[PDB]
A paper describes a structure:
More than 80% of [name]-[name]-2 variants, including Alpha and Omicron, contain an [name] mutation in the receptor-binding domain ([name]) of the spike protein. The [name] change is an adaptive mutation enabling tighter interaction with the human ACE2 receptor. We have developed a broadly neutralizing antibody (nAb), [name], whose binding affinity was intentionally optimized for Y501. This [name]-centric antibody not only interacts with the Y501-containing RBDs of [name]-[name]-2 variants, including Omicron, with pico- or subnanomolar binding affinity, but also binds tightly to the RBDs with a different amino acid at residue 501.
To understand the broad cross-reactivity and potent interaction between [name] and the [name] variants, we determined the crystal structure of [name]-Fab bound to the [name] of the Alpha variant ([name]-Fab–Alpha [name]). The crystal structure of the Fab fragment of [name] bound to the [name] of the Alpha variant reveals that the Y501-containing loop adopts a ribbon-like topology and serves as a small but major epitope in which Y501 is a part of extensive intermolecular interactions. A hydrophobic cleft on the most conserved surface of the [name] core serves as another major binding epitope. According to the classification of the antibody-binding sites on the [name], [name] belongs to the neutralizing antibodies that bind to antigenic site IIa, which includes a conserved surface patch on the [name] core and a small portion of the RBM. [name] interacts mostly with this conserved patch and a small portion of the RBM with 6 RBM residues (T500, Y501, G502, V503, Y505, Y508) being the epitope residues. A comparison of the [name]-Fab–Alpha [name] and the D27-Fab–WT [name] structures reveals the structural consequences of the CDR3 loop extensions, which significantly enhance the [name]-binding affinity from 177 nM to 7.12 nM in the KD value. Remarkably, the insertion of one serine residue (S94L) enables the side-chain of Trp93L of [name] to be inserted into a hydrophobic cleft on the [name] core surface encompassing the site IIa, making much more hydrophobic contacts and a hydrogen-bonding interaction in comparison with the corresponding residue Phe93L of D27. We next examined the structural consequences of the sequence optimization for the [name] mutation, which resulted in a two-residue change on the CDRH2 loop and drastically enhanced the [name]-binding affinity for the Alpha [name] (having Y501), by greater than 54 folds in the K D value (0.54 nM versus at least 0.01 nM). The CDRH2 loop is composed of residues G50H-G66H, and [name] has D52HA and S54HG substitutions in comparison with D27LE. These two substituted amino acids with the smallest or no side-chain avoid otherwise severe clashes with the bulky side-chain of Y501. As a result, A52H, E57H, R55H (on CDRH2), and N31H, S33H (on CDRH1) surround Y501 and Y505 (of the [name]), by making hydrophobic interactions as well as hydrophilic interactions with R403.
Residue numbers in the entry:
A (entry chain H): 2 to 133, 141 to 220
B (entry chain C): 336 to 516
C (entry chain L): 3 to 213
Write the structure that this text describes.
């Protein structure tokens, strides 16, 4: 028994998005699924819930009238549709199984799907190096969209002293990310270090050799 | 005193035909009900459960029935919904406590406990402390039913599903309403 | 509506206590969820003091009327997470969560390893430069990264993004970037980064000359 959610989406403001929540174990059975969202850097928030076996769904008073939670048992996938998307509706949206032995809780938690609700455009990140008793060197990933960016070092050779900083929402509507490493100073003139930046929502794959 | 066979009773009545026990001239304690963590909630309107232990009342009525979790908010003065309109409405000047605890172990069966019912359709709203147990074939359309249950002719009593594995908002909740006069 | 303290900081070995205050919360129903950076919430405590299968007995819950508290006994380096309390309010039919409590593990005062990164020759060709100042593995989180450019204190064009607490040594990591135009980049010479922090005898400055 495990829940799987849909992929991250980028919907322009004022639009509507549909989020799917499929149960791995064949059918949802006689369970009930609730929806919980989480704004970036904020707390958990309950939107509603549905019992796919009884066809009845209830919504929280704050979201009542804006969300539509429906399912279909031909595929046993819960759906959450949020209309009139606003800049504050950017959040990680979870679907969780409501418990039956806890008098009010959530048992299994889905991985989470992240909408952005931004009027920005897609863009690939340019990778500028950071050239240098220890030593530190990195590659600065700048100006991209959307959020997910995976940075690896030497395609996975060194990961002990790596720090990938969280993205910074720049005023241009894009993001900025920096990844650094700590390596001994004696191995700088010999061992070559390269960072691997992978931005899937734009199919950008850049490798930049770092050296003094 | 007859509280024992009111809370620890085996079977409770449906919300459309709730029961009422005449409690009077008996040594009553209201601190055991707050010390007993065997409940899920305990909200008193007007009266305080702290002074309730040392108070002499004329008569006490205990109303018992079974609803769902998401329907508990309707056992309160000034609320609407399927309950508090067609099943069990409380007066706005209510002076008493509303005890309610989960009962998924007893009132829900695996195949489906269709033995508990609630009134879905009714023409007029229920007055406070009114108990309607009729089986009138409800007529919502322009075609008079009069016994027949065809189109726009529904039996007013719908039953709860009550399956254990669902969430707590869909689970049976045993409610006991204490009214003081 | 279930208010939690914004953050609690407990020393290793000591016991972390996270209060959760609401109005008329259930006599049998307070839930506790641990959420680590980038993960889904994990139910660690339910029904006030009970625990699911697999949750260590270190976690403990407690409830006294209108305030519930989570008890993490013998806190170690793997307990940094956000903790939310949640109940099912029968009188509102809604699942109500808590504001969230961040748990920081105390540590011996570590000093930041300050590095400075001048812009690359390719970044200047785009017309905009960015100077990075790295603060590696320090504690506590409170640091002050002020930019000195030719002994002139800078303000306005700096962005700070700090990593979450580490999983092993419970240390943070700060990066501050100074983004200015390539034209205004040539208008200066000595770009410095003065880092003030506990455990530093005096502010450390890692500077470089333009060229």
């Amino acid at each position: 028994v495990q829940l799987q959610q849909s992929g991250a989406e980028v919907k322009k403001p004022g639009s509507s998005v549909k989020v799917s929540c499929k149960a791995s174990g064949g059918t949802f059975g006689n369970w009930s699924i609730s929806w919980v969202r989480q704004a970036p850097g904020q707390g958990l928030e309950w939107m509603g819930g549905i019992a796919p076996g009884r066809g009845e769904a209830t919504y929280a008073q704050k979201f009542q009238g804006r969300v539509t939670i429906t399912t279909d048992e031909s595929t046993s996938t819960a759906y959450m549709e949020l209309s009139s998307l606003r800049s504050e509706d950017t959040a990680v949206y979870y679907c969780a199984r409501e418990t039956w032995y806890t008098s009010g809780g959530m048992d299994v938690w889905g991985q989470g799907t992240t909408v952005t609700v931004s009027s920005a455009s897609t863009k690939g990140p340019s990778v500028f190096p950071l050239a240098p008793g220890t030593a530190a060197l990195g590659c600065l990933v700048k100006d991209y969209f959307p959020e997910p960016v995976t940075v690896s070092w030497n395609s996975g050779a060194l990961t002990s002293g790596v720090h990938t900083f969280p993205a910074v929402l720049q005023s241009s509507g894009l993001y900025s990310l920096s990844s650094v490493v700590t390596v001994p100073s004696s191995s700088l003139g010999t061992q070559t270090y390269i960072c691997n930046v992978n931005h899937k929502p734009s199919n950008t794959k850049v490798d930049k050799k770092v050296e003094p | 005193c007859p509280f024992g066979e009111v809370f620890n009773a085996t079977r409770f009545a449906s919300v459309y035909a709730w029961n009422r026990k005449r409690i009077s001239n008996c040594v009553a304690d209201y601190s055991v009900l707050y010390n007993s963590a065997s409940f899920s909630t305990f909200k008193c309107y007007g009266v305080s459960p702290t002074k309730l232990n040392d108070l002499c009342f004329t008569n006490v009525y205990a109303d018992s029935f079974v609803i769902r979790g998401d329907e508990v908010r309707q056992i309160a003065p000034g609320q609407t919904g399927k309950i508090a309109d067609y099943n069990y409405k409380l007066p706005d000047d209510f002076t008493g406590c509303v005890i309610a605890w989960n009962s998924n172990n007893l009132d829900s069966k695996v195949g489906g406990n269709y033995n508990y019912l609630y009134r879905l359709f009714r023409k007029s709203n229920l007055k406070p402390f009114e108990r309607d147990i009729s089986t009138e074939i409800y007529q919502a359309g322009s075609t008079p039913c009069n016994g027949v249950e065809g189109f726009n002719c529904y039996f007013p009593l719908q039953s709860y599903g009550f399956q254990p594995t669902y969430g707590v908002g869909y689970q049976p909740y045993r409610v006991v309403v204490l009214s003081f006069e | 509506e279930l208010t939690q303290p914004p953050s609690v900081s407990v020393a290793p070995g000591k016991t972390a206590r996270i209060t959760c205050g609401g109005n008329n919360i259930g006599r049998k129903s307070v839930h506790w969820y641990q959420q680590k950076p980038g993960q889904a919430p994990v139910l660690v405590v339910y029904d006030d003091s009970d625990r699911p299968s697999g949750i260590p007995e270190r976690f403990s819950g407690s409830n006294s009327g209108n305030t519930a508290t989570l008890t993490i006994s013998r806190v170690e380096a793997g307990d940094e997470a956000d903790y939310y309390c949640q109940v099912y309010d029968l009188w509102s039919s809604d699942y109500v969560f808590g504001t969230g409590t961040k748990v920081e593990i105390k540590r011996t005062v570590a000093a930041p390893s300050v590095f400075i990164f001048p812009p690359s020759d390719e970044q200047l060709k785009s017309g905009t430069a960015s100077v990075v100042c790295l603060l590696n593995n320090f504690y506590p989180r409170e640091a002050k990264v002020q930019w000195k450019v030719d002994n002139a204190l800078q303000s306005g064009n700096s962005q700070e993004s700090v990593t979450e607490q580490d999983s092993k040594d419970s240390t943070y990591s700060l990066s501050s970037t100074l983004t200015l135009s390539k034209a205004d980049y040539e208008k200066h010479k000595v770009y410095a980064c003065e880092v003030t922090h506990q455990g530093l005898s005096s502010p450390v400055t890692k500077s470089f000359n333009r060229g």
